[PDB]
Design an enzyme around this catalytic site. Structure first.
Site, mmCIF file in Angstrom:
data_model
loop_
_atom_site.group_PDB
_atom_site.id
_atom_site.type_symbol
_atom_site.label_atom_id
_atom_site.label_comp_id
_atom_site.label_asym_id
_atom_site.label_seq_id
_atom_site.Cartn_x
_atom_site.Cartn_y
_atom_site.Cartn_z
ATOM 1 C CB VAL C 46 -46.918 16.870 -11.892
ATOM 2 C CG1 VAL C 46 -47.171 15.385 -12.085
ATOM 3 C CG2 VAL C 46 -46.968 17.250 -10.415
ATOM 4 C CB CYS C 47 -45.715 21.363 -15.014
ATOM 5 S SG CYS C 47 -44.720 20.510 -16.289
ATOM 6 N N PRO C 48 -45.908 22.590 -11.870
ATOM 7 C CG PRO C 48 -44.621 24.472 -11.410
ATOM 8 C CD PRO C 48 -44.536 23.100 -12.039
#
Ligand SMILES: [N+]
Ligand SMILES: [N+]
EC number: 1.11.1.26
Lengths: 166, 166, 166, 166, 166, 166, 166, 166, 166, 166
Positions: C46-48
């Site tokens: 998942v993107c930060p």
């Protein structure tokens, strides 16, 4: 945390502008996107801002197939009383559950044991009866009712789009 | 039975026509002849007859050095609300304690565990904090407020006239 | 709920763009408005987004005398690694605590026992070390970094303006 | 409180002016409106006023389909003795149960553990064996036998008129 | 000691240069001579000497029908990250299991409760899933990767030559 | 058996032809040869033969420095009543203790749990408060009051003539 | 694992080529780098290779200020016997502890409960009595006595050079 | 008290002038009026008066269908020895049970724990194995064997004439 | 085994040809070489051979400063009776203790719980009250009294000649 | 005491001059008259006199259908070693069981918990696996091997001649 857990069994009296008092169970919370918001006490000093901000967003929320329930350890009787004897709370169209037994406030782990009142917590429940979002603020810090439509959408998107969360 | 036992420690918010909300403890019940009456819920369907019949007798009861306390598991907030938004209950001058924690209803063993409400019970307490009379009726059977002045008198007589009860 | 409770004692290694690794304890959350955000795992799929959105708001949050701490059950070593080998997370200037012992994640009741990872929860702590706000969303539902400045302000307002909450 | 609970199983010897000693069980408290009154001890110093007051009201109470039972931890033997060797108590026509085992006094939670005697308590039981009214006074404070016909009527009314209590 | 005991049930994510992330169970350790090596943390300060020394010996170990697994309480995500962002660990061709749950580190009784990290322990397991060799050194004292081929051989010899150990 | 044991502490009301009601303790049993006889119930159907037979022997027993106590779970009130409203029991000059608490009947292990009455038991106690003789017969089998003067004599002889019992 | 733990209290008889039988305690283990090796049984079928390989390395190990102890659940008597009636074991100059009570084998968690024998385990203890290295192989897989000088050196290096482990 | 209880199961050796040693069980006590008398010890210093007085009354007791058993913790061997080497005890024709196991003395709660001897107790058992009379005197105070025929008669009368006891 | 343990505290009545009955304590068993022999029962069927064989060896044993005690769960009374009414046992000059309480038979772990009798066991006790020899045979297998003088000598030798046992 | 009890289940390695090592169970002790003798330790300082005196009596014992077993907590390996490297013990032809697990020494209640060695105890077991004789001496006091042939004879006689023991 109750995040991801399933709503526990309960049975309580509710009031809703229109229908006269009626029972409610864990069931009603299943099969639909339900969002329940807890609050301290009816006829409290603090302005019912939170509750009616939700009423505004209610129109739209219903479109998304979401139902709204307000809960306090007050009796469904006072919920009605409050609803009538106050213009602000009188605009509320969603369900108002009464939790005098404290059971449902206790199950959501939001009951303050010594005051006998609930905390300002809002939960979003998927059609399966699982808690997907939790927000609990202290008295004073307000819950922004607008960010709700976003959360339920996000919740609904991920619902049928697993992993696609980037 | 709690007959002859001493009132247990408690701390709660109360409302009284006139003074703004104030705290109350087991202490308040000590030092004077106090008579506390419990009832189901505020804004209930049943008419507040019991409560106000007591208000009528209040004038005289005060002459006898007696204080009156009404109790329900409702918050002191709704007690005030009810007091204002209703002519009947609005005539009440005595103290209205709120027991949302359920602790004081529970200590007098008059709390209905499952409903979260109190039973129609009335207690008479001597200046020592000891329960001298107990009357608990079911919903429907009314409590006669008139027989109160008699009991408190009888209680007070025996108080300084031991054994003289025939 | 932990709302209104006091942060429990803990000791952990942290990393911050600039200073080389340093220790942190419960005291660093006392005396200042601290806001700690938990997340699953570093180098995750998942993107930060969540983390950096907070970075943006960081500038202003500092103005308000607020400090930011990110936490995951990862070691401070990997926090640094992630910080360097990634443009996104590399923009983060606030503190990055490592909780391999799981103690701090467990104390905030946000640790998922079976996966050994933390939940997406964000807490706001007053200068006394008491939790004033709790927000925990499920994987997918994002936490809105913007609504933070509002909450901290509201929290700060009520801090020195008791009861003035309407 | 025992209000609303069902009378517990018991078997005891009783005496009644006319019939010679006979057994009694919880069954004799079902199907009919029964009202049982407890008292300290037979041949006691306090005047049997309470008992006979009830005798007066007996005539009418029977019309209402109500039965009366007096109870003390004395043996039915002494009840009869008392009944004969005393004009006052001799006027009593209702049932006089003996509770030497203390079991029925204990089941109504009206037994004083250390003295081995019963408290001045009066119970009203509906035809289903459920307690609908409780009144327990301390030694000295008298129980008003007149307010009984009212209570039983009220009890009977609500019996077949649910909710009609205003 | 776990010497001679059977590997307990576990399920974890692993990474291996080549195949993308895959699951692993106690089943992957039965059927073949497996040798699992635990280490503190990825991206640690200490040089990954130990891990790569084993990589060297990997070529031959495979010839003997032996598989190698490295384990740390890090997530398989960081294992991959480390593997890429480092020449040294990048030479590793064997399996890299991630034990964020701490369950497998705990089952081999090699988990340091307070730090949440594993100890420098190496185990040799026969095709039946039984531990035949255990070596645990403190931080600083190195594990000699060379002495491995000898132990597995010795283990394999005795495997089909009971008692012939002199 | 309680043979040779020491009388346990007790406090009870007693009646004696002449003196008006007075208290009694295990101490009235120390310092003199006391003989306590238990019986079912006052005003019972069975003829008070046993009790009066002892009255006959009372004259002599007092000469021997022996005191006599009758005990039943009846109240001292009824003991008096019985004493007056009956020629037979009216001849009794010794002490009549009332044990409505059941404590003393229970301490002599002579209380019939289910009926709440005492068994026909007679005990002889030396000046030290120790039980020297026990006789318990069932309803029907009578206790011979005559054999008492002999037992107390025998008891007294052995008292100051140890071992001389042949 | 016992890695990093401190040696527990024990007292046992030992034998050493030269000195006649003497006692040994945990104290002998403190203040010096001691390395204790456990083995099944004396006069066993398996060749005492392991034990004598250590004898070879003994010369050097003593230079490093290290002491060596061999342990088996045999009595020190048989250790002596074995030492004499066998050329191989007769070359042993280090200490031979006897553990017939099994307590020391048990304390190092190396005792096989059902056979009553010790496992092939070798421990290295720092001058503080703390275990720095553990090696336990099954019957058949041999322990390489040579890699001992390296481990003790490494152990000693890190002893006065914390963190310098790369 | 054991009054009214049923004799517990037991198996013991007995001796009777005439028949040589034979076993005895609870059963032999059932179906007939049995009267068992316990005593300290055989060959004791105290004269066997009690035992032989019963022998005198034995003739008649048998007519009444009553059996007599003497019991002491002595072995049946010594009962016989005593019976022969003594004129007094030699006149005894009834059964002499030996209770070296102490079980039967213990079951009649007549065993003195510390001396290992029985107390001077006599019991009367109806054909059903139920204890109808108990008499326990201390050493010195004698048991009057004559009053036995009266008790068994009374016992037998009430046996088939319930309530007719006046 | 009780071998090497110390005799536990006890107090019992004993009989000895000559002196009339006297008390004995674990104290008598100290300061001198005592040898106590247990046996089933007095007046038993089996011939007192064992007891008298010991009487023969008594003469000499006394010379060695040894005392002899016979024990059975019989009363000292029967020991005397047996001693007189039997030529065989009448030759016995040593001490005959009676253990009806079973405490001393029980302390030497030689009491047969179910029969209430002692086993054929012989113990030799040094002047310190420590058991140095134990011999327990089954009914039938005899204890050889002659081998006693040898054992006590051996015991005495080793007493002041430690280790000289070859 | 274990006198008369049945040998408990066990499995151990044994050595016997001639046959190479073989297993033994509580089975070998049944079906024949077996006599097992325990001793401290092999290669002990005390001379193996006891063991070989039994060897001498072995010839005859075998004639009586008796088998001999020596037991010490030593391993069967050392038993063989001792047997070879010593003329004295080398004459032993009977079975030498090894009890390093201590289970059989413990079952015969002859294991000294703290030293981990057995006591000098000798048991004689009938063909049914029941212990008929027990002899346990302290270190120093010797067991007379000669008295064995007598005991087994006596044991065997009584075996098929019950009660004939005089
Ligand atoms: N539903
Ligand atoms: N029988």
């Amino acid at each position: 945390s109750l995040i991801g857990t399933e709503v526990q069994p309960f049975r309580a009296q509710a009031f809703q502008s229109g229908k006269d008092f009626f029972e409610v169970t864990e069931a009603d919370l299943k099969g639909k996107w339900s969002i329940v918001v807890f609050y301290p006490a009816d006829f409290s000093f603090v302005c019912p801002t939170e509750l009616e901000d939700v009423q505004k967003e209610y129109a739209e929320l219903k479109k998304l197939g979401v139902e709204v329930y307000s809960v306090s350890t007050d009796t469904h009787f006072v919920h009605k009383a409050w609803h009538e004897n106050s213009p602000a709370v009188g605009s509320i169209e969603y369900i108002m559950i009464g939790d005098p037994s404290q059971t449902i406030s206790r199950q959501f782990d939001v009951l303050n044991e010594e005051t006998g009142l609930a905390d300002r917590g809002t939960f979003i429940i998927d059609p399966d009866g699982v808690i997907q979002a939790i927000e609990i603020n202290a008295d004073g810090i307000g819950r922004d009712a607008s960010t709700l439509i976003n959360k339920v959408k996000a919740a609904q998107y991920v619902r049928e789009n697993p992993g696609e969360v980037c």
